[PDB]
Design a protein around this motif. Structure first.
Motif, PDB file in Angstrom:
ATOM      1  N   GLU A 161       0.867  -1.202   0.000  1.00 59.01           N
ATOM      2  CA  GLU A 161       0.000   0.000   0.000  1.00 59.01           C
ATOM      3  C   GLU A 161       0.887   1.230   0.000  1.00 59.01           C
ATOM      4  OE1 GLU A 161      -2.658  -0.635   3.367  1.00 59.01           O
ATOM      5  OE2 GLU A 161      -4.076  -1.796   2.105  1.00 59.01           O
ATOM      6  N   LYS A 162       2.003   1.185   0.720  1.00 64.85           N
ATOM      7  CA  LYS A 162       2.944   2.301   0.767  1.00 64.85           C
ATOM      8  C   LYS A 162       3.617   2.499  -0.585  1.00 64.85           C
ATOM      9  CE  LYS A 162       6.466   4.162   3.867  1.00 64.85           C
ATOM     10  NZ  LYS A 162       7.938   4.099   4.254  1.00 64.85           N
ATOM     11  N   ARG A 218       1.114   4.183  -2.878  1.00 66.02           N
ATOM     12  CA  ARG A 218       0.897   5.575  -2.510  1.00 66.02           C
ATOM     13  C   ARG A 218       1.986   6.471  -3.094  1.00 66.02           C
ATOM     14  NH1 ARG A 218       2.212   6.102   2.341  1.00 66.02           N
ATOM     15  NH2 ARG A 218       1.736   4.166   3.529  1.00 66.02           N
ATOM     16  N   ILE A 219       3.222   5.966  -3.095  1.00 69.39           N
ATOM     17  CA  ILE A 219       4.390   6.751  -3.483  1.00 69.39           C
ATOM     18  C   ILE A 219       4.618   6.638  -4.968  1.00 69.39           C
ATOM     19  CG2 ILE A 219       6.938   6.994  -3.273  1.00 69.39           C
ATOM     20  CD1 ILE A 219       6.510   5.997  -0.342  1.00 69.39           C
ATOM     21  N   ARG A 267       0.385   6.931  -7.420  1.00 68.91           N
ATOM     22  CA  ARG A 267      -0.672   7.823  -6.914  1.00 68.91           C
ATOM     23  C   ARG A 267      -1.836   7.997  -7.888  1.00 68.91           C
ATOM     24  NH1 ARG A 267       2.410  12.809  -9.512  1.00 68.91           N
ATOM     25  NH2 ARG A 267       0.449  14.029  -9.613  1.00 68.91           N
ATOM     26  N   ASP A 317       6.838   8.478 -11.971  1.00 72.75           N
ATOM     27  CA  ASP A 317       6.651   8.217 -10.539  1.00 72.75           C
ATOM     28  C   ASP A 317       7.920   7.980  -9.761  1.00 72.75           C
ATOM     29  OD1 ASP A 317       3.587   8.027 -10.357  1.00 72.75           O
ATOM     30  OD2 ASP A 317       4.037   6.664 -11.984  1.00 72.75           O
TER      31      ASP A 317
END
Ligand SMILES: O=P(O)(O)OC[C@H]1O[C@](O)(COP(=O)(O)O)[C@@H](O)[C@@H]1O
Ligand SMILES: O=P(O)(O)OC[C@H]1O[C@](O)(COP(=O)(O)O)[C@@H](O)[C@@H]1O
Ligand SMILES: O=P(O)(O)OC[C@H]1O[C@](O)(COP(=O)(O)O)[C@@H](O)[C@@H]1O
Ligand SMILES: O=P(O)(O)OC[C@H]1O[C@](O)(COP(=O)(O)O)[C@@H](O)[C@@H]1O
Ligand SMILES: O=P(O)(O)OC[C@H]1O[C@](O)(COP(=O)(O)O)[C@@H](O)[C@@H]1O
Lengths: 250, 250, 252, 250, 250
Positions: free
Chosen positions: B4-5, B8-9, B12, B54
């Motif tokens: 999940e981290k 997120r990074i 997104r 990203d």
């Protein structure tokens, strides 16, 4: 920034000449017969001092027994012999912490990219790099592709690969072989990026002029300078020639 | 939850493009001759920034000397050269702890399932995974079966095996090769379960269109996105094509 | 006594069925095409629950991402692929301490006696065994002679050797291959002594009846039960057949 | 002085009989079919007690599951199988500290001098020896030259080399093979010096008389005693013959 | 300065004779049949004392069981057998810390430059050297190139390489093989620089005069003295010959 530190210590004049003297293990003492004083580490230190060079490269035993603080020391951590026939490999015989205790201002580590044992050297370099950062001693990677697919070590693409690998693995400065011409050497220098490049001197040239011309090409390619052994101390006029090298480089 | 981290990074917008730049060790600088600016890590950062990607994938040396915090960093922990001829092996040259200090938001580690040294990379990945959890950095496993029985690295069964091994060993995200079609690639995505899949870009394609169709298939297969190097920075129109990739993926 | 802990958790009814699911690494996902739902670890957990089995065997990645506490977990610590061509070797990709954190009630470790790398697995197992005792997690040694002089992995004398080695090295329970008959398999069980024996299921049999007959043999030989993967989840009637196995094994 | 300790525990009568039972790993259970009760470690402990022997030798798994404190224990730390086909090697599967916790009064470790892996076992033994001293447990080195130049393991010069190596590396007692006669075996005993020698029993002899004559020769040569397995427990009259071996030795 | 410590202890008269007795592992006890008292370490200590030699060299097991503090001890840390057929390698069976506890005044470590396992011994020696410095025990490196490209171990260039390697790696004293003449041997001594050189005695010579002759040349070449085993204790007139050596060297 350990590259900045390396440059302050070993390139105060803007270029660098390091007198290399790890040959006693890498090649053995047959190298020393041309100029027998070259077997004496005390003579080597005096020579580097009297020519006004920036440093010397010693293995731990030479440093322990002879180093006197008179010229900055790069402690060459690993070492192999030419008697060895296997896939090229060179393991550390000294830790960064011991190098600090012996008076070193930087550490050196040889890698042989392409070797069947390339993994062994990369694994150890990881630990040496971490320690170099911990002890704030710049790390000089001596990048010499050897074994595997490597045939001609001075081939333009091999020398460029050597330079890039050194940058990628965390070298603060590096030593590589000369390609024999400034155009192709300048690409190696380019791919090294922010990390300064020292040309390895190589076997003694046929004439002094031949070596001087190589050094001129190294400097035109944008290298920081030279890490020279045989082309200085294998000569009976070592000091005279050393001072000529100093005039050219500085 | 480190997946999940990671999302997120690095995802997104729901999909991900990572600009891969470990090539300086893996392939050497011959990769950079087409578009010479590509030899310069600052150019790569600007490219990732300007195209709206990203993240970037750097080896430790490039991260240390060049990383500026402008785009999220994946620190590629291991590395080998193409000069090497043995059973495929790539060992860590950097620790997770050092990756954290260098500003990494995730770590990458390559495995070669099937290799005679598959065991050596599984042993090390064990330690890397444990450290990734301890330091709360997502682990991207780059899973590239090679050596052993592997003779077609893009065969449907091999890419699905690559994906599943990555899940089994603890990857939080994974990078695998494209099979060449979305049906067989969707099976690799399925077997990866909750772990997002990035497609490795591969050699530069004959046309930009050829690459875009592959990327379309990857997305139709349900992959998270791409980790692309050569098919962006080997082009002289790198930024233009990078933006077309961004348009398609996002 | 970690054997007693193993039996309490994994053999409350006196016999044990463990649903094995390390195949994603050992064999890869080609195992999953017959019954595609078998690629989904959530399906595997529901199956073990619904069928009333005692446990599941997962690698660390599947345990981390999917394990939900619903059936006891044996964390399979090592793992290798079939793509590998060397002398058989399987090294740990997980520690016992991490297994504890992942909710494991036991740990599993494969050894390949006879392998040129026999020594590498015995060396690592020594560390894993010491850690199992420290963390009070039973150790299941999966003993599969392979490499060296081994030419028939289900030969009576190879399976008995497999069993005895597991006892000697400190297994609290073990998993070994079936010989194909209860007389020769009962010798393996005998030499394993106080350490309980689980039969490894093997490749999907031609008929369900062939598998039930092997399991019947295993139980007659005095084994604790079975650690089965393909012969349950490679079947489209996985749950029906799993429940049939439960009645054979737990029902006697 | 751990030799004195060994002798106090395992040779209170001045001579020693140790019942060896590491066969389950070393040879596998085919050894146990001649007398099937021999597969049961509870039977083996009763046998050793009932015959009045000095000790038993167990691997860690047998000690953990079965050892009851009723006869002194030698924990055999390493072990290999006969399925293995490489250069002979046997690594520890148990530490000295764990042996103490399992109730051992000594530890045993096998070496195969001459093996291509001789270095691996010497490296390990160094650590084991150090721990033996730390935990005050006598170390029994089981010295069996094998591989390399070794053709005949019971040759006089090989058995003597075996005995000397055990002394040199720090054995507090040793186990070696019989040469087949008291004269040659007495030279092995001599070169072992202050370290007592136990004869390894070997394959079940054709008659009980044959083995008794061997043990006599062993005792004639000045050895401390025997470490016997098959020649006791492979016999259906195990206890009756064991009592004859006790009458002879003691 | 551990060289000076070495000289104070082992060369108080300005030259050295060390009685070497690691043969029990290196060669086996066949070496002892000529003079069977030579198998008794108590005899060896008596010999060293009565001939007024400066030290003995023992492996750990002999030191533990027999060393009585009567003559200074060099603890030979590693050891291999002649039964072994691979590339030459000799790993430590004892730590420097243990050697201190055993009463050692110095430690010895054999390297085989050129071996396929050169790296393994260099790695280990690095640890031993670090410990030698820590415990303030002189390190004697026994430098015997073997394996790899080594064809003749007593070749002039090989022995000199052997001497230089020892210096480079951090020996405080060294032991090398004789070249068979003082002129070439003096080159080995010269390249050893500040580190003293002991000649390895070698096979028992045909006559006593031949050995003295060798010794006369070794001293002529500037070596510190000899580390002699066979040419003393293999002789049935051991003590006498030993006293004739003491007369010559001192
Ligand atoms: O491949 P080579 O010729 O052994 O190069 C390595 C040697 O060259 C050097 O880098 C520089 O010395 P030279 O100038 O004599 O070549 C030494 O430090 C090193 O031992
Ligand atoms: O080992 P290979 O097959 O050359 O590909 C691995 C390379 O591909 C990448 O994953 C992605 O880069 P590319 O898009 O250029 O293929 C790199 O990170 C990595 O070095
Ligand atoms: O020799 P194989 O066929 O790879 O068997 C090993 C496999 O069998 C098992 O022990 C049990 O699963 P199966 O019932 O599918 O055989 C697995 O845990 C293991 O991966
Ligand atoms: O060379 P072998 O036959 O494997 O001998 C080793 C075996 O012999 C022993 O030393 C003694 O047992 P035996 O009396 O049966 O020979 C065992 O401990 C050991 O496993
Ligand atoms: O390895 P080699 O050639 O057998 O000789 C090395 C031996 O010689 C010595 O250095 C000296 O003993 P010798 O004088 O008997 O040769 C011993 O310590 C060592 O074991």
């Amino acid at each position: 920034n350990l590259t900045e530190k390396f440059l302050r210590i070993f390139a105060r004049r803007g270029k660098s000449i390091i007198l290399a003297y790890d040959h006693g293990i890498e090649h053995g003492p047959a190298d020393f017969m041309d100029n027998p004083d070259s077997a004496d580490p005390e003579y080597i230190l005096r020579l580097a001092r009297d020519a006004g060079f920036d440093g010397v490269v010693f293995q731990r035993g030479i440093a322990e027994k002879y180093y006197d603080g008179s010229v900055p020391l790069i402690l060459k951590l690993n070492g192999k012999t030419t008697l060895y026939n296997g896939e090229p490999v060179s393991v550390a015989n000294c830790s960064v912490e011991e190098a600090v205790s012996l008076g070193a201002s930087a550490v050196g580590y040889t890698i042989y990219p392409g070797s069947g044992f390339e993994w062994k050297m990369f694994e150890e370099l990881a630990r040496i790099k971490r320690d170099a950062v911990k002890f704030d001693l710049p790390l000089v990677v001596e990048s010499f592709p050897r074994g595997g697919k490597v045939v001609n070590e001075t081939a333009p693409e091999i020398v460029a690969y050597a330079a890039r690998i050194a940058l990628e693995l965390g070298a603060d400065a590096m030593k590589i072989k000369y390609t024999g011409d400034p155009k192709t050497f300048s690409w190696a220098v380019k791919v090294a990026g922010k990390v300064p490049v020292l040309m390895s001197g190589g076997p003694k040239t046929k004439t002094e002029e031949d070596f001087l011309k190589q050094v001129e090409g190294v400097l035109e390619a944008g290298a920081l300078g030279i890490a020279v052994g045989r082309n200085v101390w294998q000569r009976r006029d070592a000091l005279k020639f050393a001072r000529a090298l100093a005039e050219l480089v500085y």
